[PDB]
mmCIF file with all atom_site columns, C-alpha atoms and ligand atoms in Angstrom:
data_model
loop_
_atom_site.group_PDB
_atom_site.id
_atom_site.type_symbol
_atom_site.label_atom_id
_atom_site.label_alt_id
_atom_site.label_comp_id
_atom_site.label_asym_id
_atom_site.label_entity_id
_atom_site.label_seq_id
_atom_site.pdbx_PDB_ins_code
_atom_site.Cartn_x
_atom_site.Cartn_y
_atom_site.Cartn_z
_atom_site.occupancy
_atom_site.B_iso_or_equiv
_atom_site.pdbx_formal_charge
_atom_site.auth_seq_id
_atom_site.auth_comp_id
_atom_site.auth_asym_id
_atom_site.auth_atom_id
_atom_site.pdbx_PDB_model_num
ATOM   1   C  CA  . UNK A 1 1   ? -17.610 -12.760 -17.820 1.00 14.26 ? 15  UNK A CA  1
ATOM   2   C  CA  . UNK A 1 2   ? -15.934 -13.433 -14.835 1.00 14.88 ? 16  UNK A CA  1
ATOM   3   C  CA  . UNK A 1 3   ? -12.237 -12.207 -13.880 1.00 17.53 ? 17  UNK A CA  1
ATOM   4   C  CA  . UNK A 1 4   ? -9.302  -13.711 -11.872 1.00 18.61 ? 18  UNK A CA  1
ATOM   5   C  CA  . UNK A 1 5   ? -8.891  -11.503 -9.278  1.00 21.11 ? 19  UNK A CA  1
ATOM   6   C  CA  . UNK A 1 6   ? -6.499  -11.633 -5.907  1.00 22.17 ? 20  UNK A CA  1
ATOM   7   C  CA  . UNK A 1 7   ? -8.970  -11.404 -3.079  1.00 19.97 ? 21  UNK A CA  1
ATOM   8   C  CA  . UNK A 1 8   ? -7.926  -7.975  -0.729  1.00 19.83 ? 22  UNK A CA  1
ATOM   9   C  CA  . UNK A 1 9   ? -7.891  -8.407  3.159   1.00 22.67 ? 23  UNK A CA  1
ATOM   10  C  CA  . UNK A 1 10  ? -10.106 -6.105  5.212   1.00 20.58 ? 24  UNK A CA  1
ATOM   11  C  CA  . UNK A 1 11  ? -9.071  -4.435  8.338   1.00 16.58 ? 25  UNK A CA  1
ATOM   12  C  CA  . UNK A 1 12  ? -9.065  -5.379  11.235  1.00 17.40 ? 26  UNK A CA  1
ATOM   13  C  CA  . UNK A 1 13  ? -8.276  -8.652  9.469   1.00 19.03 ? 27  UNK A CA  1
ATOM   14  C  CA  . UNK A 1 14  ? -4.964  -10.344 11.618  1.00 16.88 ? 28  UNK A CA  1
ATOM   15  C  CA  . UNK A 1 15  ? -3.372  -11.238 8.789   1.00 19.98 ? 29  UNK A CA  1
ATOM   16  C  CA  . UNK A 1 16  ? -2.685  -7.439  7.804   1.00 15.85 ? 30  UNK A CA  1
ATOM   17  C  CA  . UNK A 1 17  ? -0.258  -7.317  10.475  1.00 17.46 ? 31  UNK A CA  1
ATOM   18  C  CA  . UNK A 1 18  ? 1.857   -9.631  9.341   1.00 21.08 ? 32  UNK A CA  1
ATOM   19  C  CA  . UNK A 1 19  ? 5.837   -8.114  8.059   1.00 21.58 ? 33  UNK A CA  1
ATOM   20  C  CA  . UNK A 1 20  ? 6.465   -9.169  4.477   1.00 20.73 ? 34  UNK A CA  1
ATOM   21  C  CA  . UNK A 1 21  ? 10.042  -10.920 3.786   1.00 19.90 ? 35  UNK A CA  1
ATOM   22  C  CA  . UNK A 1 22  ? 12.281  -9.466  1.201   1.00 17.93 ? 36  UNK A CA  1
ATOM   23  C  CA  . UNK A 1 23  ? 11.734  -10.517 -2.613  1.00 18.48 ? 37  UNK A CA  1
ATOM   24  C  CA  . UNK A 1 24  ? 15.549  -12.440 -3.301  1.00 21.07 ? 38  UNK A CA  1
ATOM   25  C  CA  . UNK A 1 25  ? 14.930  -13.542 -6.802  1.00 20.87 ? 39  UNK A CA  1
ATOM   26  C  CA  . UNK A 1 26  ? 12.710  -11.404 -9.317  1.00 23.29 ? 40  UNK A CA  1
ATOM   27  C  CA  . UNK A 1 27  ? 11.386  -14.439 -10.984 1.00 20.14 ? 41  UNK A CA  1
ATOM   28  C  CA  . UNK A 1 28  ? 8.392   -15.020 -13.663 1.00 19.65 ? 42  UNK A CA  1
ATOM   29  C  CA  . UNK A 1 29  ? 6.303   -16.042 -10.546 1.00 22.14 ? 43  UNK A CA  1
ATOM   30  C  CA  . UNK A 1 30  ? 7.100   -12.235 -9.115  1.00 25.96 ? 44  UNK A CA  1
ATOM   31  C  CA  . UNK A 1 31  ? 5.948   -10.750 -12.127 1.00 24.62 ? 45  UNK A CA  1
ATOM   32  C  CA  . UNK A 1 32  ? 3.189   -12.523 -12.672 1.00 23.04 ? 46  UNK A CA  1
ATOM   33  C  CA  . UNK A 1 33  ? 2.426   -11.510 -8.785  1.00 23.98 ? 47  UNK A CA  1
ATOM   34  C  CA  . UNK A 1 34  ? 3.110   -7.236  -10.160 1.00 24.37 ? 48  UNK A CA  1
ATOM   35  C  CA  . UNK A 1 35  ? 0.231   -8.380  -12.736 1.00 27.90 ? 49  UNK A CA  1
ATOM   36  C  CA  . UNK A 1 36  ? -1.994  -9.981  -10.615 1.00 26.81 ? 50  UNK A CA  1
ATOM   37  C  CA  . UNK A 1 37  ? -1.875  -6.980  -8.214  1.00 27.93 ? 51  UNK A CA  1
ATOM   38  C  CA  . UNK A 1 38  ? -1.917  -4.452  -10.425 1.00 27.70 ? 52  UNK A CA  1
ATOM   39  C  CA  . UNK A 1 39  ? -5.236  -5.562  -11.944 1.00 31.33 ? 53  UNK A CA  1
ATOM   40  C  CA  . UNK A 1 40  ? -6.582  -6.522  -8.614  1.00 33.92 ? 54  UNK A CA  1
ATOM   41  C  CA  . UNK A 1 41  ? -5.396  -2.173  -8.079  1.00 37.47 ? 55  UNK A CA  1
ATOM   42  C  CA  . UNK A 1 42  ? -7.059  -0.880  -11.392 1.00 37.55 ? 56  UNK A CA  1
ATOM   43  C  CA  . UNK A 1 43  ? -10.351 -3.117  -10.921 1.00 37.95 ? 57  UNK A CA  1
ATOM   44  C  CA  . UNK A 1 44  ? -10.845 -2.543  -7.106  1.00 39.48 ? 58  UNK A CA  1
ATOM   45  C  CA  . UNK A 1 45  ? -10.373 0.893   -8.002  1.00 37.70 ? 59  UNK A CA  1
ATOM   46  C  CA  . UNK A 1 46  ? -7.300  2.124   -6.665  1.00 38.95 ? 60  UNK A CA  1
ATOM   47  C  CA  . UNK A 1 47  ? -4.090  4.222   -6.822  1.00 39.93 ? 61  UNK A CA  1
ATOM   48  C  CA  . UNK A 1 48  ? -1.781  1.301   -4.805  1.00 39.25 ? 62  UNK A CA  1
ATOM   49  C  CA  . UNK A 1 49  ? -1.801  -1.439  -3.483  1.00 37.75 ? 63  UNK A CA  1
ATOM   50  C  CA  . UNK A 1 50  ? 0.622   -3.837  -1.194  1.00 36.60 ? 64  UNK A CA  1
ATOM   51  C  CA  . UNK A 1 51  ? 0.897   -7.761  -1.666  1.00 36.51 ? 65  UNK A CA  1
ATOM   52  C  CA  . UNK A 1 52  ? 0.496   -7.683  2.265   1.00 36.74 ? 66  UNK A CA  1
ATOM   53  C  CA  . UNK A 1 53  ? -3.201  -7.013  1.037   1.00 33.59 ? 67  UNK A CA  1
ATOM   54  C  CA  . UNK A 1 54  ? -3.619  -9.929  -0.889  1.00 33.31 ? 68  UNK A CA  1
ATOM   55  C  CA  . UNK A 1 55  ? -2.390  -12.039 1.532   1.00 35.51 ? 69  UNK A CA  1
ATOM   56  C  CA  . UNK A 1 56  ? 1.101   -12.581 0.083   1.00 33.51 ? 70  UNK A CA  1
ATOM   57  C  CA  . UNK A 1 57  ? 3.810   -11.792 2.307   1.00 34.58 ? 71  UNK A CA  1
ATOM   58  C  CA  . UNK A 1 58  ? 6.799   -10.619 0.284   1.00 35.94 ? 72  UNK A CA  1
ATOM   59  C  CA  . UNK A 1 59  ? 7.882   -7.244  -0.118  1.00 35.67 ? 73  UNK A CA  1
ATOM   60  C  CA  . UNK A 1 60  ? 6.139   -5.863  -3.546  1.00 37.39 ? 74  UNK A CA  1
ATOM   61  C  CA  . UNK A 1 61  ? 3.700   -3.369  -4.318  1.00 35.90 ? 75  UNK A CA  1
ATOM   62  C  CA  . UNK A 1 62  ? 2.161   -1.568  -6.975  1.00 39.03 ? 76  UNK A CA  1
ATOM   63  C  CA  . UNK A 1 63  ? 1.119   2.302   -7.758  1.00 40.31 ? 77  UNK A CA  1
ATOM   64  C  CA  . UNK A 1 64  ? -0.213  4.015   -10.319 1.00 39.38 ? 78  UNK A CA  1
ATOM   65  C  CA  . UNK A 1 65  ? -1.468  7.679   -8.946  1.00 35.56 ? 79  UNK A CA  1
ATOM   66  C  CA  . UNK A 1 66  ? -1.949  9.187   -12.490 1.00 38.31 ? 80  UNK A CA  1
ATOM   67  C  CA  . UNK A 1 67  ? -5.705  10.092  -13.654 1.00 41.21 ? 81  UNK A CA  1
ATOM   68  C  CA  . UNK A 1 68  ? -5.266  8.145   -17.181 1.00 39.02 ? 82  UNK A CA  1
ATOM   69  C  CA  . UNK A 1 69  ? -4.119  5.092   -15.093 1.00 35.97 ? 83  UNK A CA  1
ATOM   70  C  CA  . UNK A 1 70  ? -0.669  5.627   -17.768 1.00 36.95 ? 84  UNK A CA  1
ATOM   71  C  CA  . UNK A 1 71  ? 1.673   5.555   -14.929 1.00 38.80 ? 85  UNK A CA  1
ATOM   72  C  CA  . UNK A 1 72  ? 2.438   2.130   -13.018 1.00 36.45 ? 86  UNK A CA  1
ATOM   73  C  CA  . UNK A 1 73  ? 5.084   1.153   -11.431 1.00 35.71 ? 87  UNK A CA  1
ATOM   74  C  CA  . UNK A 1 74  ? 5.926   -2.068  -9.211  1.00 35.92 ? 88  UNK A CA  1
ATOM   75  C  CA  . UNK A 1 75  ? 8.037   -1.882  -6.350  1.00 35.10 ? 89  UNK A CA  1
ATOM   76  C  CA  . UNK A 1 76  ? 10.142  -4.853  -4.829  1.00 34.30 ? 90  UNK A CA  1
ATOM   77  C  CA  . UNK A 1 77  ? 12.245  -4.681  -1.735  1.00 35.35 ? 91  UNK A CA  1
ATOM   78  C  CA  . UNK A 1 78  ? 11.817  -0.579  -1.563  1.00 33.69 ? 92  UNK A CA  1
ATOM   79  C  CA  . UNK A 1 79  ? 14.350  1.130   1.202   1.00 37.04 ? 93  UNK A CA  1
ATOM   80  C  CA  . UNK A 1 80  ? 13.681  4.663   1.922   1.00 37.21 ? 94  UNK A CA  1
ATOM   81  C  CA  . UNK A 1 81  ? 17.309  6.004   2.110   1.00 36.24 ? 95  UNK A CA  1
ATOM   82  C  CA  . UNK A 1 82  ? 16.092  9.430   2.433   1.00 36.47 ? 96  UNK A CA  1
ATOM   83  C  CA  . UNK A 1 83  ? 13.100  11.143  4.454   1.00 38.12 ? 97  UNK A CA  1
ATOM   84  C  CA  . UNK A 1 84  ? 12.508  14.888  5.330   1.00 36.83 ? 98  UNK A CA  1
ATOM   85  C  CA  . UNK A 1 85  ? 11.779  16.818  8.403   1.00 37.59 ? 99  UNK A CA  1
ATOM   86  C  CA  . UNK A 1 86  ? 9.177   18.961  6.266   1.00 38.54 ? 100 UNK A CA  1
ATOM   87  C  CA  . UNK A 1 87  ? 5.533   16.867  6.921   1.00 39.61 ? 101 UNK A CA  1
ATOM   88  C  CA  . UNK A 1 88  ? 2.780   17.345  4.746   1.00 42.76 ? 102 UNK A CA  1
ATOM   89  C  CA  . UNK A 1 89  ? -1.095  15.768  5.969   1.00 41.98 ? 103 UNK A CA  1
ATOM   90  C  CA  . UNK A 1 90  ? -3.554  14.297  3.814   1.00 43.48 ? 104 UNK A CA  1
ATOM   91  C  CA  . UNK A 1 91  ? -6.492  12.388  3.823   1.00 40.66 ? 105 UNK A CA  1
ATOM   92  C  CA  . UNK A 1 92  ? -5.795  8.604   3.415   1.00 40.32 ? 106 UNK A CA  1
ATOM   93  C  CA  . UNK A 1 93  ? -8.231  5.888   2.059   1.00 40.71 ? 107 UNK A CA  1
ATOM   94  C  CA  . UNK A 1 94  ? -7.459  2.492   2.032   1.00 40.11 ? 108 UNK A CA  1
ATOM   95  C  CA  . UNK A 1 95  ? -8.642  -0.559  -0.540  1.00 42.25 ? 109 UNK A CA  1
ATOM   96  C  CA  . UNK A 1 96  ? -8.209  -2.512  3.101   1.00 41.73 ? 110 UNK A CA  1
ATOM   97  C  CA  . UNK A 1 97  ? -10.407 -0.176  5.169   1.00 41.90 ? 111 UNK A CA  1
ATOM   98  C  CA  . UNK A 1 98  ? -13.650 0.362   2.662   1.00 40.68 ? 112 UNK A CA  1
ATOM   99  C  CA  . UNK A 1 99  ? -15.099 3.868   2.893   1.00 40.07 ? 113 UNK A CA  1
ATOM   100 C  CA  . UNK A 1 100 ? -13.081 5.121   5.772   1.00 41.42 ? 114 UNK A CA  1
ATOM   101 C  CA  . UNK A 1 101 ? -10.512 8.676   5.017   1.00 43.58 ? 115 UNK A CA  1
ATOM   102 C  CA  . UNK A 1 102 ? -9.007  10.399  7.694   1.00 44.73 ? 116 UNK A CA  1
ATOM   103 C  CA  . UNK A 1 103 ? -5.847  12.724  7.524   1.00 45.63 ? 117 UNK A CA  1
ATOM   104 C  CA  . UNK A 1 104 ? -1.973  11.173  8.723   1.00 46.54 ? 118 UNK A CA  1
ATOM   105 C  CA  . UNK A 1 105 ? 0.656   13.152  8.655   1.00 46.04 ? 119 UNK A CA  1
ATOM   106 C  CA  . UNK A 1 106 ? 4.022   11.873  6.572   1.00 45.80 ? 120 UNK A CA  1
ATOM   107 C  CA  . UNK A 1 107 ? 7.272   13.105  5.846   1.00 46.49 ? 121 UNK A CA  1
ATOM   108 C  CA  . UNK A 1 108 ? 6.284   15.561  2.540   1.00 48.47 ? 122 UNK A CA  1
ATOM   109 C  CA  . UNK A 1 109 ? 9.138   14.052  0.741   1.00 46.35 ? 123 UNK A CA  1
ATOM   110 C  CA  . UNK A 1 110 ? 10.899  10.826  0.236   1.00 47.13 ? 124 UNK A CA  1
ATOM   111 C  CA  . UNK A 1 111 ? 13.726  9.033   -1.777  1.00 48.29 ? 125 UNK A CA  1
ATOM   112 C  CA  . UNK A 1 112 ? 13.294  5.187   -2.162  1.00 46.44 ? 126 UNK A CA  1
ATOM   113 C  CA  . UNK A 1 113 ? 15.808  2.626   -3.977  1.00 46.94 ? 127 UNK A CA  1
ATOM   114 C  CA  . UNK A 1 114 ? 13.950  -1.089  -5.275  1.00 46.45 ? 128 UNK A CA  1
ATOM   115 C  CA  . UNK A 1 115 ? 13.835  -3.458  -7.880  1.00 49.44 ? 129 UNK A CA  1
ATOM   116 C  CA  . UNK A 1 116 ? 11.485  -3.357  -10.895 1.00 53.16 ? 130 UNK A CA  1
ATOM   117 C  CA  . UNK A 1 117 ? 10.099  -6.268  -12.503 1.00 55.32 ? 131 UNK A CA  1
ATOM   118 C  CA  . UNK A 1 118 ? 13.497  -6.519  -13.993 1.00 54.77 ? 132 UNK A CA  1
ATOM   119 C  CA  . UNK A 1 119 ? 15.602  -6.987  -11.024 1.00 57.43 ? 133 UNK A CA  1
ATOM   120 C  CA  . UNK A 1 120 ? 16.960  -3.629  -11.616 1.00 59.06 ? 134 UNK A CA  1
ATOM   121 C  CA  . UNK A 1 121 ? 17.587  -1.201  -8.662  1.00 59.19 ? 135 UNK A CA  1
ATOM   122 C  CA  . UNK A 1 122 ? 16.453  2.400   -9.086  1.00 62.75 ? 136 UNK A CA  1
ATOM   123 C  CA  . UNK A 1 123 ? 15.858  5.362   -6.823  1.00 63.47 ? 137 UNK A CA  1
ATOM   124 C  CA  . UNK A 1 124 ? 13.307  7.858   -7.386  1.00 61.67 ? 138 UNK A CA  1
ATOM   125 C  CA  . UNK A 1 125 ? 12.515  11.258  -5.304  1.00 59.38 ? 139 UNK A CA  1
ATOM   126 C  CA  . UNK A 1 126 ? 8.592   10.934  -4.331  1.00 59.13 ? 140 UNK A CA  1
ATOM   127 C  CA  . UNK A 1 127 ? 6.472   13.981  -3.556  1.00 60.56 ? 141 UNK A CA  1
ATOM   128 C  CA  . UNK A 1 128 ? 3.394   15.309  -3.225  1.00 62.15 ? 142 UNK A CA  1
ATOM   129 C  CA  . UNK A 1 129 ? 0.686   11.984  -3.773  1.00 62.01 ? 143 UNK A CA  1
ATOM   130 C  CA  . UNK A 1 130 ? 3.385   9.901   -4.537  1.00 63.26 ? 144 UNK A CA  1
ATOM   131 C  CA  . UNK A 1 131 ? 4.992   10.839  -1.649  1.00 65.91 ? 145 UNK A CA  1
ATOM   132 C  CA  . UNK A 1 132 ? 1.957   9.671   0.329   1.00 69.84 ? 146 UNK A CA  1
ATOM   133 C  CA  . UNK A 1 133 ? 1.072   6.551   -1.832  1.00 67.47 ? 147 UNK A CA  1
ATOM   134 C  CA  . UNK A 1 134 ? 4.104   4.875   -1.003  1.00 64.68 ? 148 UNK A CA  1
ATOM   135 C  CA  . UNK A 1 135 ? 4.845   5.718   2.383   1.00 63.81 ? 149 UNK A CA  1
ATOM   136 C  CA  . UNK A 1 136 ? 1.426   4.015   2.545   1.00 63.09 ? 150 UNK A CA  1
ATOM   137 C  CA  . UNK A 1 137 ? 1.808   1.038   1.023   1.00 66.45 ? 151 UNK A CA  1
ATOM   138 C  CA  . UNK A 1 138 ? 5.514   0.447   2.844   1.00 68.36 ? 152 UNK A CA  1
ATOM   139 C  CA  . UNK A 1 139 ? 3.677   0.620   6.121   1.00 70.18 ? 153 UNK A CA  1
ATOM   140 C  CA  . UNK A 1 140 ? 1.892   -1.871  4.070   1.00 64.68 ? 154 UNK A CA  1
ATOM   141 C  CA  . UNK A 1 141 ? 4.233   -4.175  4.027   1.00 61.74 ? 155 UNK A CA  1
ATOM   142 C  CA  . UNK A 1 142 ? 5.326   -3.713  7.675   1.00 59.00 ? 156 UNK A CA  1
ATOM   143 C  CA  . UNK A 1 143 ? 2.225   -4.612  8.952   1.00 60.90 ? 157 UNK A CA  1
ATOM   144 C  CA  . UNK A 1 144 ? 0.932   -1.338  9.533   1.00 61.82 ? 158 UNK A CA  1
ATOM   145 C  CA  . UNK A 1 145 ? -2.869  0.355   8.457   1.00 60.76 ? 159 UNK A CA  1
ATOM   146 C  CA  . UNK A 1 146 ? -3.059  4.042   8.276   1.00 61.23 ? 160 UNK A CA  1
ATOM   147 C  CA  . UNK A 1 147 ? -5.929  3.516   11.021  1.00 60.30 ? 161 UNK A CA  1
ATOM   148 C  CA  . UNK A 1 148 ? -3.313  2.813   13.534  1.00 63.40 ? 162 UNK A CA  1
ATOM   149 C  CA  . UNK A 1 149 ? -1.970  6.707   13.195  1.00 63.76 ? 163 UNK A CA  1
ATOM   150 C  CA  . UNK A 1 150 ? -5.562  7.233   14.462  1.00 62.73 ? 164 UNK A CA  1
ATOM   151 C  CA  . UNK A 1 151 ? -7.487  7.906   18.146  1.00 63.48 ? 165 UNK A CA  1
ATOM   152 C  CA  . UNK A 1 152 ? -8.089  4.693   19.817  1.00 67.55 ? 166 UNK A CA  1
ATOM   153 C  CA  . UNK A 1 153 ? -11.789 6.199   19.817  1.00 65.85 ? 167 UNK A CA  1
ATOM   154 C  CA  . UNK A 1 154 ? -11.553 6.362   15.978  1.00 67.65 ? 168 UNK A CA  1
ATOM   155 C  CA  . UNK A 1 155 ? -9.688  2.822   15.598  1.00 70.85 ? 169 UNK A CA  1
ATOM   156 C  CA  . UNK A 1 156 ? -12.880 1.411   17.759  1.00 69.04 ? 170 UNK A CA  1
ATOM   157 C  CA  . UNK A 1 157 ? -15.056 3.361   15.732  1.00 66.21 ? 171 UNK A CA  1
ATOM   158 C  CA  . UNK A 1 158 ? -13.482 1.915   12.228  1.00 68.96 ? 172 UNK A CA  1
ATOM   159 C  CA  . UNK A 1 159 ? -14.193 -1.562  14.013  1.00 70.16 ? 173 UNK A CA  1
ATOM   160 C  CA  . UNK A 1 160 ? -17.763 -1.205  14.253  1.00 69.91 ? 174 UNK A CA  1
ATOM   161 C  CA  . UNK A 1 161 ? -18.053 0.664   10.561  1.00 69.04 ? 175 UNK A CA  1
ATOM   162 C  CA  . UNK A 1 162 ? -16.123 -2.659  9.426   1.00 66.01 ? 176 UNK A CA  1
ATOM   163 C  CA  . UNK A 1 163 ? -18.349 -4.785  11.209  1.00 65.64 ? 177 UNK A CA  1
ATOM   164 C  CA  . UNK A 1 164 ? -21.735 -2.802  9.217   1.00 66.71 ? 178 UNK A CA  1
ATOM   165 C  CA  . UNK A 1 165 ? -19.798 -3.303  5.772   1.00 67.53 ? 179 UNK A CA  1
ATOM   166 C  CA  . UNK A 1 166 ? -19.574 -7.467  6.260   1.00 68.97 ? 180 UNK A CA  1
ATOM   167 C  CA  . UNK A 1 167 ? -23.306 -7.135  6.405   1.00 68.52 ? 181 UNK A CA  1
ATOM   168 C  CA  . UNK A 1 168 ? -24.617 -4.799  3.528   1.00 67.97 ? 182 UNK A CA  1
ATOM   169 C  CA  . UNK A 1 169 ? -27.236 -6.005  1.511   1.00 69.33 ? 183 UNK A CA  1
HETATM 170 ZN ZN1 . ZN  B 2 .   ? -3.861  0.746   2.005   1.00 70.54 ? 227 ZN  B ZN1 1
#
């Protein structure tokens, strides 16, 4: 049985690049995009993902980061209105860079305001993976890959691995 998917871009795909415009109306057609991504997340497998990815240019993403996959929750138009001078690294993969994880340093802790799929603003204090995970996928929707933190040497590198993966048999 087949499955309706949203198709995710691979770096150094142009169209990654690309800076989402804000979500003004939290419609049926933006939750139906939160569905579409989050299964496109859980079957990929993943712990987030941005709509940037799918090639849909509007500021919404999705993250679940628990083991049980119990815990998503969709972002639209998220602000950071708080960072902190403490960093914390970790080692980032990317559904957008297959089988590449190097370490980026972040800010260790962040507070974001968005919308859920009800229109609803909330703000939640994000640390430790979550901290990460969105970071990530706001960089995401800014046009930014986590391969850009990296050594020119190790972005050219990243080419040629994505180059190899096009080709696998
Ligand atoms: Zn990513």
């Amino acid at each position: 049985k087949t499955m309706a998917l949203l198709n995710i871009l691979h770096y150094p795909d142009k169209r990654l690049h690309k800076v989402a415009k804000p979500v003004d109306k939290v419609d049926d057609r933006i939750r139906k995009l939160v569905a579409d991504m989050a299964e496109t997340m859980y079957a990929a497998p993943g712990i987030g993902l941005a709509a940037t990815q799918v090639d849909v240019h509007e500021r919404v993403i999705v993250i679940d980061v628990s083991e049980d996959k119990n815990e998503l929750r969709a972002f639209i138009n998220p602000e950071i209105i708080w960072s902190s001078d403490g960093k914390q690294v970790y080692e980032e993969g990317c559904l957008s860079v297959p089988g590449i994880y190097d370490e980026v340093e972040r800010p260790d802790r962040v507070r974001v305001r968005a919308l859920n799929e009800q229109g609803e603003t909330f703000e939640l204090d994000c640390e430790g993976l979550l901290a990460v995970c969105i970071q990530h996928e706001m960089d995401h929707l800014m046009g930014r890959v986590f391969v850009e933190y990296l050594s020119p040497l190790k972005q050219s590198r990243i080419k040629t691995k994505m180059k190899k993966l096009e080709r696998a048999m």
